[PDB]
């Protein structure tokens, strides 16, 4: 029952905010989860779906693309698809509202760590 969350700029995959780790995660998995995320980001373009669900066994990836930002979440296959997108939707509207103008010009990775707090608070409400 998790919500490994990652927000990155589509143009170049620059990470923005994230809340990967959870109650005692496994270095092996956490590493594989992040690497799979990168290979997803690097491939994103204009032809990509703005909403998408990607199967990976016990785990399933879900993401949305809005304003050039990819909101991605990894969770148990069992987790309600419909829920994952609401979670993402809440993150989006709050993120764009609070950082849309600055998102396309930042160059340092995780320039929005601050947002991690909102992700955490929003997470509780779903899991």
Coordinates of N, CA, C and O in Angstrom, one line a residue:
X1 N 0.9 -1.2 0.0 CA 0.0 0.0 0.0 C 0.9 1.3 0.0 O 1.1 1.9 1.0
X2 N 1.4 1.6 -1.2 CA 2.3 2.8 -1.3 C 1.9 3.7 -2.4 O 1.1 3.4 -3.3
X3 N 2.6 4.8 -2.5 CA 2.4 5.8 -3.5 C 3.8 6.5 -3.8 O 4.0 7.7 -3.5
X4 N 4.7 5.7 -4.4 CA 6.0 6.2 -4.7 C 5.8 7.2 -5.8 O 5.4 6.9 -6.9
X5 N 6.0 8.5 -5.4 CA 5.7 9.6 -6.3 C 6.8 10.4 -6.9 O 7.7 10.8 -6.1
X6 N 6.8 10.7 -8.2 CA 7.8 11.5 -8.8 C 7.3 12.5 -9.8 O 6.4 12.2 -10.6
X7 N 7.8 13.7 -9.7 CA 7.3 14.8 -10.6 C 8.5 15.3 -11.3 O 9.5 15.7 -10.7
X8 N 8.5 15.2 -12.7 CA 9.6 15.7 -13.5 C 9.2 16.5 -14.7 O 8.1 16.3 -15.2
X9 N 10.1 17.3 -15.2 CA 9.8 18.2 -16.3 C 10.0 17.3 -17.6 O 11.0 16.7 -17.8
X10 N 8.9 17.3 -18.4 CA 9.0 16.5 -19.6 C 10.1 16.8 -20.6 O 10.8 15.9 -21.0
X11 N 10.2 18.1 -20.9 CA 11.3 18.5 -21.8 C 12.6 17.8 -21.7 O 13.1 17.3 -22.7
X12 N 13.1 17.7 -20.5 CA 14.4 17.1 -20.3 C 14.4 16.1 -19.1 O 15.5 15.8 -18.6
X13 N 13.3 15.7 -18.5 CA 13.3 14.8 -17.4 C 13.9 15.3 -16.1 O 14.2 14.5 -15.2
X14 N 14.0 16.6 -16.0 CA 14.6 17.1 -14.7 C 13.6 16.8 -13.6 O 12.4 17.1 -13.6
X15 N 14.1 16.2 -12.5 CA 13.2 15.9 -11.4 C 12.8 17.3 -10.8 O 13.5 18.2 -10.9
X16 N 11.6 17.3 -10.2 CA 11.1 18.5 -9.6 C 10.8 18.3 -8.1 O 11.4 19.1 -7.3
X17 N 10.0 17.4 -7.8 CA 9.7 17.0 -6.4 C 9.5 15.5 -6.4 O 9.3 14.9 -7.5
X18 N 9.5 14.9 -5.3 CA 9.4 13.5 -5.2 C 9.2 13.0 -3.7 O 9.6 13.8 -2.8
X19 N 8.6 11.9 -3.6 CA 8.4 11.2 -2.3 C 8.4 9.7 -2.6 O 7.4 9.0 -2.5
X20 N 9.6 9.2 -2.9 CA 9.9 7.8 -3.2 C 9.8 6.9 -2.0 O 8.9 6.2 -1.8
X21 N 10.8 7.0 -1.2 CA 10.9 6.1 0.0 C 9.7 6.1 0.9 O 8.9 7.0 1.0
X22 N 9.5 4.9 1.5 CA 8.3 4.6 2.3 C 8.8 3.8 3.5 O 10.0 3.5 3.7
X23 N 7.9 3.5 4.4 CA 8.2 2.7 5.6 C 9.1 1.5 5.3 O 8.6 0.4 4.9
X24 N 10.4 1.6 5.5 CA 11.3 0.6 5.2 C 11.2 0.0 3.8 O 10.5 -1.0 3.6
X25 N 11.8 0.7 2.9 CA 11.7 0.3 1.5 C 13.0 -0.6 1.3 O 13.8 -0.6 2.1
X26 N 13.1 -1.3 0.1 CA 14.2 -2.1 -0.2 C 15.1 -1.4 -1.2 O 14.6 -1.1 -2.3
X27 N 16.4 -1.2 -0.8 CA 17.3 -0.5 -1.7 C 17.2 -1.1 -3.1 O 17.3 -0.3 -4.1
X28 N 17.1 -2.4 -3.3 CA 17.0 -3.0 -4.6 C 15.8 -2.5 -5.4 O 16.0 -2.0 -6.5
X29 N 14.6 -2.6 -4.8 CA 13.4 -2.1 -5.4 C 13.5 -0.6 -5.7 O 13.3 -0.2 -6.8
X30 N 13.7 0.2 -4.7 CA 13.8 1.6 -4.8 C 14.7 2.1 -5.9 O 14.3 3.1 -6.6
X31 N 15.8 1.4 -6.1 CA 16.7 1.7 -7.2 C 16.1 1.4 -8.5 O 16.1 2.2 -9.5
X32 N 15.5 0.2 -8.6 CA 14.9 -0.3 -9.9 C 13.6 0.6 -10.2 O 13.3 0.8 -11.4
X33 N 12.9 1.1 -9.2 CA 11.8 1.9 -9.4 C 12.2 3.2 -10.0 O 11.5 3.8 -10.9
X34 N 13.2 3.8 -9.4 CA 13.7 5.1 -9.9 C 14.3 5.1 -11.3 O 14.1 6.0 -12.1
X35 N 15.0 4.0 -11.6 CA 15.6 3.8 -12.9 C 14.5 3.6 -14.0 O 14.7 4.1 -15.1
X36 N 13.5 2.9 -13.7 CA 12.4 2.7 -14.6 C 11.7 4.0 -14.8 O 11.2 4.3 -15.9
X37 N 11.7 4.8 -13.8 CA 11.1 6.2 -14.0 C 11.8 7.0 -15.0 O 11.2 7.6 -15.9
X38 N 13.2 7.0 -14.9 CA 14.0 7.8 -15.8 C 13.8 7.3 -17.3 O 13.6 8.2 -18.2
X39 N 13.8 6.0 -17.5 CA 13.6 5.5 -18.8 C 12.2 5.9 -19.4 O 11.9 5.8 -20.6
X40 N 11.3 6.3 -18.5 CA 10.0 6.6 -18.9 C 10.0 8.1 -19.3 O 9.4 8.5 -20.3
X41 N 10.6 8.9 -18.4 CA 10.7 10.3 -18.7 C 11.5 10.7 -20.0 O 11.0 11.4 -20.8
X42 N 12.7 10.1 -20.1 CA 13.5 10.3 -21.3 C 12.7 10.0 -22.6 O 13.0 10.6 -23.7
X43 N 11.8 9.1 -22.6 CA 11.0 8.7 -23.7 C 9.8 9.6 -24.0 O 9.3 9.7 -25.2
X44 N 9.3 10.4 -23.0 CA 8.2 11.2 -23.2 C 8.3 12.3 -24.3 O 9.4 12.9 -24.3
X45 N 7.3 12.5 -25.1 CA 7.3 13.5 -26.1 C 5.9 14.0 -26.3 O 5.0 13.7 -25.5
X46 N 5.6 14.8 -27.4 CA 4.3 15.3 -27.6 C 3.3 14.2 -28.1 O 2.1 14.4 -27.8
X47 N 3.8 13.2 -28.7 CA 3.0 12.1 -29.1 C 2.6 11.2 -28.0 O 1.7 10.3 -28.1
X48 N 3.1 11.4 -26.8 CA 2.8 10.6 -25.6 C 1.4 10.8 -25.1 O 0.8 11.9 -25.2
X49 N 0.8 9.8 -24.4 CA -0.5 9.9 -23.9 C -0.4 10.8 -22.7 O 0.6 10.8 -21.9
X50 N -1.4 11.7 -22.4 CA -1.4 12.6 -21.3 C -1.8 11.9 -20.0 O -1.5 12.3 -18.9
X51 N -2.4 10.7 -20.2 CA -2.8 9.9 -19.0 C -2.3 8.5 -19.4 O -2.5 8.1 -20.6
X52 N -1.8 7.7 -18.5 CA -1.4 6.4 -18.8 C -1.1 5.5 -17.6 O -0.7 5.9 -16.6
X53 N -1.4 4.2 -17.8 CA -1.2 3.1 -16.8 C -0.2 2.1 -17.3 O -0.5 1.6 -18.4
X54 N 0.8 1.8 -16.6 CA 1.8 0.8 -17.1 C 2.1 -0.3 -16.1 O 2.6 -0.1 -15.0
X55 N 1.7 -1.5 -16.6 CA 1.9 -2.7 -15.8 C 3.3 -3.2 -15.6 O 4.1 -3.3 -16.5
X56 N 3.6 -3.6 -14.4 CA 4.9 -4.2 -14.0 C 4.8 -5.2 -12.9 O 5.5 -5.1 -11.9
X57 N 3.9 -6.2 -13.1 CA 3.8 -7.2 -12.1 C 3.0 -6.9 -10.9 O 1.8 -6.5 -11.0
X58 N 3.6 -7.0 -9.7 CA 3.0 -6.7 -8.5 C 2.8 -5.2 -8.4 O 2.0 -4.7 -7.6
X59 N 3.6 -4.4 -9.2 CA 3.5 -3.0 -9.2 C 2.9 -2.4 -10.5 O 3.0 -3.0 -11.6
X60 N 2.3 -1.2 -10.4 CA 1.8 -0.6 -11.6 C 2.0 0.9 -11.6 O 1.8 1.6 -10.6
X61 N 2.5 1.4 -12.7 CA 2.8 2.8 -12.8 C 1.6 3.6 -13.4 O 0.9 3.0 -14.3
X62 N 1.4 4.8 -13.0 CA 0.3 5.6 -13.5 C 0.9 7.0 -13.5 O 1.6 7.5 -12.6
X63 N 0.5 7.8 -14.6 CA 1.0 9.1 -14.7 C 0.1 10.0 -15.6 O -0.7 9.4 -16.3
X64 N 0.2 11.3 -15.4 CA -0.5 12.2 -16.3 C 0.5 13.3 -16.7 O 1.5 13.5 -16.0
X65 N 0.3 13.9 -17.9 CA 1.2 14.9 -18.4 C 0.3 16.1 -18.6 O -0.7 16.1 -19.4
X66 N 0.6 17.2 -17.9 CA -0.1 18.5 -17.9 C 0.9 19.6 -17.8 O 1.8 19.5 -17.0
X67 N 0.8 20.6 -18.7 CA 1.8 21.7 -18.8 C 3.2 21.3 -18.8 O 4.1 22.0 -18.2
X68 N 3.5 20.2 -19.5 CA 4.9 19.8 -19.7 C 5.5 19.2 -18.4 O 6.8 19.1 -18.3
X69 N 4.7 18.8 -17.5 CA 5.2 18.2 -16.2 C 4.5 16.8 -16.1 O 3.3 16.6 -16.3
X70 N 5.4 15.8 -15.8 CA 4.9 14.4 -15.7 C 4.7 14.1 -14.2 O 5.6 14.1 -13.5
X71 N 3.5 13.7 -13.8 CA 3.2 13.3 -12.5 C 3.1 11.8 -12.5 O 2.2 11.3 -13.1
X72 N 4.0 11.2 -11.8 CA 4.1 9.7 -11.8 C 4.0 9.1 -10.5 O 4.6 9.6 -9.5
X73 N 3.3 8.0 -10.4 CA 3.1 7.3 -9.1 C 3.2 5.8 -9.3 O 2.6 5.2 -10.3
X74 N 3.9 5.1 -8.5 CA 4.0 3.7 -8.6 C 3.3 3.0 -7.3 O 3.5 3.5 -6.2
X75 N 2.5 2.0 -7.6 CA 1.8 1.4 -6.5 C 1.5 -0.1 -6.7 O 1.8 -0.6 -7.8
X76 N 1.0 -0.7 -5.7 CA 0.6 -2.2 -5.8 C -0.4 -2.3 -7.0 O -1.3 -1.5 -7.2
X77 N -0.3 -3.4 -7.7 CA -1.2 -3.6 -8.8 C -2.6 -3.5 -8.3 O -3.5 -3.0 -9.1
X78 N -2.9 -4.0 -7.1 CA -4.2 -4.0 -6.5 C -4.8 -2.6 -6.3 O -6.1 -2.5 -6.2
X79 N -4.0 -1.6 -6.2 CA -4.6 -0.2 -5.9 C -5.5 0.3 -7.0 O -5.2 0.2 -8.2
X80 N -6.7 0.8 -6.6 CA -7.6 1.3 -7.6 C -7.1 2.4 -8.5 O -6.7 3.5 -8.2
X81 N -7.1 2.0 -9.8 CA -6.6 2.9 -10.9 C -7.2 4.2 -10.7 O -6.5 5.2 -10.7
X82 N -8.5 4.3 -10.7 CA -9.2 5.6 -10.5 C -8.7 6.4 -9.4 O -8.7 7.6 -9.5
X83 N -8.3 5.8 -8.3 CA -7.7 6.6 -7.2 C -6.4 7.2 -7.5 O -6.2 8.4 -7.3
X84 N -5.5 6.4 -8.1 CA -4.2 6.9 -8.5 C -4.2 8.2 -9.3 O -3.4 9.1 -9.1
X85 N -5.2 8.3 -10.2 CA -5.3 9.5 -11.0 C -5.9 10.7 -10.3 O -5.6 11.9 -10.6
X86 N -6.7 10.5 -9.2 CA -7.2 11.6 -8.4 C -6.0 12.1 -7.6 O -5.9 13.3 -7.5
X87 N -5.2 11.2 -7.1 CA -4.1 11.5 -6.3 C -3.2 12.4 -7.2 O -2.8 13.5 -6.8
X88 N -2.9 12.0 -8.4 CA -2.1 12.7 -9.4 C -2.8 14.1 -9.7 O -2.1 15.1 -9.7
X89 N -4.1 14.1 -9.9 CA -4.8 15.3 -10.2 C -4.7 16.3 -9.1 O -4.5 17.5 -9.4
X90 N -4.8 15.9 -7.8 CA -4.6 16.8 -6.7 C -3.3 17.4 -6.8 O -3.1 18.6 -6.6
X91 N -2.2 16.6 -7.0 CA -0.9 17.1 -7.1 C -0.7 18.1 -8.2 O -0.1 19.1 -8.0
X92 N -1.2 17.8 -9.4 CA -1.1 18.7 -10.5 C -1.7 20.1 -10.2 O -0.9 21.1 -10.2
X93 N -3.0 20.2 -10.0 CA -3.6 21.5 -9.8 C -2.9 22.3 -8.7 O -2.8 23.5 -8.8
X94 N -2.4 21.7 -7.7 CA -1.7 22.4 -6.7 C -0.3 22.8 -7.2 O 0.2 23.9 -6.9
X95 N 0.4 21.9 -7.9 CA 1.7 22.2 -8.4 C 1.7 23.3 -9.4 O 2.5 24.3 -9.3
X96 N 0.9 23.2 -10.4 CA 0.8 24.2 -11.5 C 0.4 25.6 -10.9 O 1.0 26.6 -11.3
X97 N -0.6 25.5 -10.1 CA -1.0 26.8 -9.4 C 0.1 27.4 -8.7 O 0.3 28.6 -8.8
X98 N 0.9 26.6 -7.9 CA 2.0 27.2 -7.2 C 3.3 27.3 -7.9 O 4.2 28.1 -7.4
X99 N 3.6 26.6 -9.0 CA 4.9 26.7 -9.6 C 5.0 26.6 -11.1 O 6.1 26.6 -11.7
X100 N 3.8 26.6 -11.8 CA 3.8 26.6 -13.3 C 4.7 27.6 -14.0 O 5.5 27.2 -14.9
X101 N 4.7 28.8 -13.6 CA 5.5 29.9 -14.2 C 7.0 29.7 -14.0 O 7.7 30.0 -14.9
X102 N 7.4 29.1 -12.9 CA 8.8 28.9 -12.7 C 9.3 27.5 -13.2 O 10.5 27.4 -13.5
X103 N 8.4 26.5 -13.3 CA 8.8 25.2 -13.8 C 9.6 25.1 -15.1 O 10.5 24.4 -15.2
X104 N 9.2 25.9 -16.1 CA 9.9 25.8 -17.4 C 11.3 26.5 -17.5 O 11.9 26.4 -18.5
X105 N 11.7 27.2 -16.4 CA 13.0 27.9 -16.4 C 14.1 27.4 -15.4 O 15.2 27.8 -15.4
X106 N 13.7 26.5 -14.5 CA 14.6 26.0 -13.5 C 15.6 25.1 -14.2 O 15.3 24.6 -15.2
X107 N 16.8 25.0 -13.6 CA 17.9 24.2 -14.1 C 18.4 23.2 -13.1 O 19.1 22.2 -13.5
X108 N 18.3 23.5 -11.8 CA 18.8 22.7 -10.8 C 17.8 21.6 -10.5 O 16.5 21.8 -10.6
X109 N 18.2 20.3 -10.3 CA 17.3 19.3 -10.0 C 16.6 19.4 -8.6 O 17.2 20.0 -7.7
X110 N 15.3 19.0 -8.5 CA 14.6 19.1 -7.3 C 14.6 20.5 -6.8 O 14.9 20.8 -5.6
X111 N 14.2 21.5 -7.6 CA 14.2 22.9 -7.3 C 12.9 23.1 -6.5 O 12.6 24.3 -6.1
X112 N 12.0 22.1 -6.3 CA 10.8 22.3 -5.6 C 10.6 21.3 -4.5 O 9.5 20.8 -4.2
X113 N 11.7 21.0 -3.8 CA 11.7 20.1 -2.6 C 10.5 20.5 -1.7 O 9.8 19.6 -1.2
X114 N 10.4 21.8 -1.6 CA 9.3 22.4 -0.8 C 8.0 21.6 -1.0 O 7.3 21.2 0.0
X115 N 7.7 21.3 -2.3 CA 6.5 20.6 -2.6 C 6.3 19.2 -2.0 O 5.2 18.7 -2.0
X116 N 7.5 18.7 -1.6 CA 7.5 17.3 -1.1 C 6.5 17.2 0.1 O 5.7 16.2 0.3
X117 N 6.4 18.3 0.9 CA 5.5 18.4 2.0 C 4.1 18.2 1.5 O 3.3 17.4 2.1
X118 N 3.7 18.9 0.5 CA 2.3 18.7 0.0 C 2.0 17.3 -0.5 O 1.0 16.8 -0.3
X119 N 3.0 16.7 -1.2 CA 2.9 15.4 -1.6 C 2.6 14.4 -0.4 O 1.7 13.6 -0.5
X120 N 3.4 14.6 0.6 CA 3.3 13.7 1.8 C 1.9 13.9 2.4 O 1.1 12.9 2.6
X121 N 1.5 15.2 2.7 CA 0.2 15.4 3.2 C -1.0 14.9 2.3 O -1.9 14.3 2.8
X122 N -0.8 15.0 1.0 CA -1.8 14.5 0.1 C -1.9 13.0 0.1 O -2.9 12.4 -0.1
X123 N -0.7 12.4 0.2 CA -0.6 11.0 0.2 C -1.5 10.3 1.3 O -2.3 9.5 1.1
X124 N -1.3 10.8 2.6 CA -2.0 10.3 3.7 C -3.5 10.1 3.4 O -4.1 9.1 3.7
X125 N -4.1 11.1 2.8 CA -5.5 11.1 2.4 C -6.0 10.0 1.5 O -7.1 9.7 1.5
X126 N -5.1 9.4 0.7 CA -5.5 8.3 -0.2 C -5.1 6.9 0.4 O -6.0 6.1 0.4
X127 N -3.9 6.7 0.8 CA -3.6 5.5 1.4 C -4.1 5.4 2.8 O -4.5 6.4 3.3

